[PDB]
Amino acid sequence: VPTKMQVTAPANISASAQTFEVACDYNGAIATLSDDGDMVGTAIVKDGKAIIKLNESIADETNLTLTVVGYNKVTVIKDVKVEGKPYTVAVSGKTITVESPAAGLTIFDMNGRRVATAKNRMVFEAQNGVYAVRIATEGKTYTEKVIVK
Numbered sequence: 012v013p014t015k016m017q018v019t020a021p022a023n024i025s026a027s028a029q030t031f032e033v034a035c036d037y038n039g040a041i042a043t044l045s046d047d048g049d050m051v052g053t054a055i056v057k058d059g060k061a062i063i064k065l066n067e068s069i070a071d072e073t074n075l076t077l078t079v080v081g082y083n084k085v086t087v088i089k090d091v092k093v094e095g096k097p098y099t100v101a102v103s104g105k106t107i108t109v110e111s112p113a114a115g116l117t118i119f120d121m122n123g124r125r126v127a128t129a130k131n132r133m134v135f136e137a138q139n140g141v142y143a144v145r146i147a148t149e150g151k152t153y154t155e156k157v158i159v160k
Contacts, residue, residue, distance in 0.1 A: 016040060018079045018087040026070040026095045026145065027123045031063045033079065040081035044091070046072050056081075069093055070119030071143035071156040095125070098146040100155040107135045107142065107157050115147040 016037040024031055024044075033042040035056045042061035043053040051069055054061035056079075069075060070093075077089040098111030109116045110132045118127040121140045127133060135142075137159040144155045 013083045013085045016079070016081055016084045016087065018042075018077075018089070020077055020089060021091065022089075023092045023094055024069065024075065026072075026093050026117075026119060026143070027125055028069065029065055029123060031065065031077075031091075033061045033063065033077065034059060035061060035079055035081075037081045037084055040079050040084065042077065042079045044069070044075045044077055046075055051075060065123075068119055068121055068123035068141075068143060070095075070123050070125075070145065071154045073152055073154060095145045095147060095152070097148060098153065100144045100146075100157060102157050102159060105137050105139075105159055107137050107144065107159065109133050109135070109144055109146065111146045111148065113148070115145075117145040117147070119143040119145070 018035045020033040040056040044051045052063040052065040054063040072093045075091045079087045095117050101108040127135045142157045146153045
């Protein structure tokens, strides 16, 4: 029969974040952030903390799952909200065109840095790489991930 461990972590994470700190009272436990199957980062608990260094931008996520696993411990799971149909995200070479009536549009680069903010419509002039696009309507945020060659 496994025992319990104590885990405390924020309820939210910035779309631009680079790390995520989890307190846990079992040294050697493993804390991991994921979007079911995309493993976005992992750290071992040492001195009561795991500082998860994210391996990719999470700006294309609305939620992530925190999982903390330990030898003979009951696994602890938490949802974490990531905070920056009725739209289109278009790519054409180096330009990304985003449209959605009455929406906040945001674009983030592959280092999680926010590169563009506009209302309703924008054209963004990109560089080679992967971007996240956030379209924030009333009641709901959507995201897409765009590859620019």
